[PDB]
């Protein structure tokens, strides 16, 4: 059974921000299914967003009877068919598509009882990750740390602003570094935020890989080889020493979101904390 | 009440081939509602087609659990929500978006009891229409008759081949020139094909403009000024003498679908017939 008012979970953020780990940890909860990245969801959301932003095109669709209410019903039906049918059924359905939260406020309107988890990671870690692993993202130039940090900045700013707009009951910022440093503390806060009972299996996600009511992985997704491992603090500051010094000097100019999100833009690395 | 097995009608063809007149005449039937061009349907269908064509992307979606059956279910849900909600209810729902029939075969699979009407006009008439009226279409360079006829040919061929593939019980070629010359004869054939009982009000579509259970129009659509008039033979051969001589000489090479569809490529104009 499924409908637009059902309690959904949308995980997202900039790619290489620990979103797969986040969803896998939730997938280890026996009552939660998130599953693999749908890929189609960000694209149809983006398509929709282009129609509504264009005031010329918005006039034409409304003149055709394709109003907001009609479009929002069509989007609700499409998105629910992907979310419900692409994985196994569960009490609490989840969806992880990083850039779905570029339409966070819109999804909050389409799905009134949906809750959102915006994953945040030090932009220098996300950018280094996508460059060193050669993870292609549209518009991100992987031959430039400067260009990647700029695009990181714009993406996270858009999603952060929408997260803060919908408010603390609908959206929760989740710092990757804090999650890996203090996994029991943050999973407890997350499940209380989501209003789902605590289950220790979220901290043993590596033992639920490929199991019934567990973590379903895609063999061609780029986080699979890291997510099979248990939670560790090994990816906190692999970026340190790898960013060019011109970009290091210009860090606060290129990425002012670092400081807004509590990251020191001239610490190499910041004191994220210790477990 | 609506569902994927309901008897839907899909009108299409290359723009400027009498698609608005076709749907207006059917709209004039009191038990049929088509309504204005949705616009979103061609775009989401074309998006879906880009995913299925790329074998690389098709593998990634199947590995995410986003199979053909999941996509089709989401496509079905989206298209029905638009088709049903963007206009007034009726026993027989209809949809007119010219380029939706580029996914005719796929629409036939999604909607088994759906029937199709491919509007066919002399390409020289359709191309002259879009150039003279300055109708902007993606890919169609309005400075060049050669380019527009080449794009007309490509577009109409794709839709024709699909119309032919599904067969004479699901798709029907409707010749614009024949429709306007013999409107009673063809509308009687069409409603017999669609398995809808005869109603003479389809022959007075001009008297049903903006009426309840009648012809809903869009003030921003390019065919509105012509369709409000009664059916006439006025636009059969306005194109003659306006195409350049180098294009006229190469006409059969540029547009071999003219001949396949019973239009003489070297007649200026052909004898379409007389009432």
């Amino acid at each position: 059974a499924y409908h637009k008012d059902m309690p959904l979970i949308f995980i997202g953020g900039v790619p290489r921000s620990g979103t797969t780990l986040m969803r896998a940890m939730l997938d280890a909860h026996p009552d939660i299914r998130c599953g693999e990245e749908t890929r189609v969801i960000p694209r149809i959301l983006a398509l929709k967003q282009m129609w509504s932003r264009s005031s010329k095109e918005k006039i034409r669709l409304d003149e055709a009877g394709v109003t907001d209410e009609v479009l929002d019903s069509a989007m609700q039906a499409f998105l629910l068919e992907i979310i419900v049918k692409h994985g196994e059924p569960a009490p609490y359905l989840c969806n992880k598509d990083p850039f779905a939260l570029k339409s966070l406020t819109y999804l909050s309107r389409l799905f009134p009882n949906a809750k959102f988890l915006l994953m945040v990671r030090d932009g220098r870690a996300s950018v280094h990750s996508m460059i060193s692993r050669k993870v292609t993202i549209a518009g991100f130039d992987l031959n430039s740390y400067r260009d990647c940090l700029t695009k990181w900045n714009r993406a996270i700013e858009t999603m952060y602003n929408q997260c803060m707009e919908v408010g603390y009951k609908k959206c929760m910022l989740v710092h990757y570094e804090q999650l890996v440093l203090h996994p029991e503390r943050w999973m407890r806060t997350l499940l209380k935020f989501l209003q789902i009972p605590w289950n220790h299996s979220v901290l043993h996600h590596e033992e639920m890989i490929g199991k019934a009511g567990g973590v379903s992985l895609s063999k061609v997704e780029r986080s699979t080889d890291q997510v099979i491992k248990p939670v560790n603090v090994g990816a906190l500051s692999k970026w340190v020493g790898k960013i060019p010094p011109d970009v290091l000097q210009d860090m606060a100019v290129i990425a002012p979101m670092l400081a807004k999100l509590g990251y020191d833009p001239y610490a190499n690395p910041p004191n994220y904390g210790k477990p | 009440a609506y569902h994927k097995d309901m008897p839907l009608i899909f009108i299409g063809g290359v723009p400027r081939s009498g698609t608005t007149l076709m749907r207006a005449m059917l709209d004039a039937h009191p038990d049929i509602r088509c309504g204005e061009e949705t616009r979103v349907i061609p775009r989401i269908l074309a998006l879906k087609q880009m995913w299925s064509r790329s074998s690389k992307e098709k593998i990634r979606l199947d590995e995410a659990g986003v199979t053909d059956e999941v996509l089709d279910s989401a496509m079905q849900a989206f298209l029905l929500e638009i088709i049903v909600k963007h206009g007034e209810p009726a026993p027989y729902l209809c949809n007119k978006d010219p380029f939706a029939l580029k996914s005719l075969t796929y629409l036939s699979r999604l909607f088994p009891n759906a029937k199709f009407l491919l509007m066919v006009r002399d390409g020289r008439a359709s191309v002259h229409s879009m150039i003279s009226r300055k109708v902007t279409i993606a890919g169609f360079d309005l400075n060049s008759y050669r380019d527009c006829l080449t794009k007309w040919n490509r577009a109409i061929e794709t839709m024709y081949n699909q119309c032919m593939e599904v067969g004479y019980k699901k798709c029907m070629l409707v010749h614009y020139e024949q429709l306007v010359l013999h409107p009673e004869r063809w509308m009687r054939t069409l409603l017999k094909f669609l398995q809808i009982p005869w109603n003479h009000s389809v022959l007075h579509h001009e008297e049903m403009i903006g009426k309840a259970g009648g012809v809903s129009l869009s003030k921003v659509e390019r065919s509105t000024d012509q369709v409000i008039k009664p059916v006439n033979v006025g636009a059969l051969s306005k194109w003659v003498g306006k195409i350049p001589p180098d294009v006229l000489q190469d006409m059969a090479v540029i547009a071999p679908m003219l001949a396949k569809l019973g239009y003489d490529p070297y007649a200026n104009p052909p004898n379409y017939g007389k009432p």
């Binding site: 890929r39 850039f99 993870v135 993202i137 549209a138 780029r222 | 990634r60």
Partner: peptide, 5 residues
């Protein structure tokens, strides 16, 4: 894609 994202 298409790209990884």
């Amino acid at each position: 894609e298409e790209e990884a994202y």
